[PDB]
Amino acid sequence: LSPQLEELITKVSKAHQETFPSLCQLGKYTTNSSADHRVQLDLGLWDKFSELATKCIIKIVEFAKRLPGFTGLSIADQITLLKAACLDILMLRICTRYTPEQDTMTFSDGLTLNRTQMHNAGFGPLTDLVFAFAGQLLPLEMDDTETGLLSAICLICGDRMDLEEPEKVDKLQEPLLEALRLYARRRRPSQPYMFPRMLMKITDLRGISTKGAERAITLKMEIPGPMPPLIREMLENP
């Protein structure tokens, strides 16, 4: 139904907004920690970072629980999808919080770190790639609903291994693909390549997140304690 599609767009949009404040709504604040230059790892920063990442994962789970039919999958599947797409979405999220002018990224509490600090916080040799991926997201000029829809598409993917009902997941993803094309084309009929362009960006995102996963490895060797529990759950995945 057209009305059905219109409401799916609103629901997803709202769940995204409610679980992820736009840069504009944030009371930005900074820190002086290792703003100087790049070091292997700033623990005070990784600490603030892992806390913000953990709270983010919880917000992603809340977002997933609010997508139509997610909650209808078996618990096994809900966890499988969450584990498999969580890093992707965490990456899409901070990359949409990037300010080209200041070359910064803002987290959900307003904490705004420059490139050096993102590096020092744990991104290590992967920070410039993340920043370059973020920069390449800019031309897409996506709004909160498109970002919300793109996220719902990354998460509800029936091609993950270990899925008990891939078929149900594929049926759930379908309307999301439709809502995004309709919405994207309605908003910008002047540029019909936006929809396939956003879709192709899913592939890029899966490439940076796999590199993010590799970074968690070396990072594990570098921190003085185990990584936060929810972060560990996320990184245990096929």
Ligand SMILES: CC1=C(/C=C/C(C)=C/C=C/C(C)=C/C(=O)O)C(C)(C)CCC1
């Ligand atoms: C967990 C983790 C990583 C990525 C974190 C990301 C992508 C966090 C996003 C946070 C947001 C988006 C916070 C907020 O909005 O407050 C990297 C790649 C360093 C590897 C080590 C463990």
